[PDB]
Symmetry: none
Subunit: 61 residues, 6 copies
């Protein structure tokens, strides 16, 4: 079906994901999967089958 | 069916996910799955089948 | 069916998820699944089948 | 001596002089002298001597 | 002496002099002298001697 | 002496003098003298001697 997105902004500002750490001993950072982060961000049908986007670290020390 | 999104903003400002830590010993940060974060953020039908987006760390020390 | 979203804002400001920690020993942060966080945030039909978005850490020490 | 004028407005709107007439036979409009009309309008020492600003029509039919 | 004018506006709008007539027979419009009309309009010492700014029509029919 | 004018506007809009007539028989329009009309309009010492700025029509029919 139809999906109409119309925007008439003026002076937009976007930040997406942001990670910060300090004085840590052991850092592990994992980002992704389906991050989109726009000014007119649009996502549709990220999975349309028996499929996975499991951005799963699995820290097993 | 129809899905109409119309916006006529002026001077919008967006922050999405934001993580901060300090003086930690062992840091583990996992982000994703279906993060979108827009000024006109739109998501639709993120899963349309027997599928998973399980952004599941599984810290097993 | 129809889903009409109309907005005529002026000077909007949005923060989404925000995590903060201090003096911790062992930090574990997991975010995602279907975070959207817009100025005109819209989600629809996040699951339309036998599927899961279980952003479930499972800290098993 | 000192004359300090400080303003920190936001969204100001000013109209100055405004004349309107209708169905008149004989119209005579005279404006001036020391009209100032600002958003931070300031006037000082408009006359500092034996001088005149007499915006005086003198309709003598 | 000192004369300090400071302004930190945002979105100002100014109209100065405005004349309107309709269905008149005989129109006479005279403007001037020391009209200033700013967003940070400032006037100072418009006359500093034996001098005149008499914007005086003198309609003598 | 000092005369300090500081402005930090954003999106200013100015109209100065504006004359309108309709269906008139005999129109006479005279403007001037010391019209200034700025966004940071400043005037100072418009007359500093035995002198005149008399923008005076003198309609003598």
């Amino acid at each position: 079906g139809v999906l109409y997105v119309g925007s008439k902004t003026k002076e937009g500002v976007v930040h997406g994901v942001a990670t910060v750490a300090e004085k840590t001993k052991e850092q592990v950072t994992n980002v992704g999967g389906a991050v989109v982060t726009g000014v007119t961000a649009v996502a549709q049908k990220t999975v349309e089958g028996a499929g996975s986007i499991a951005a799963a670290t699995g820290f097993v020390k």
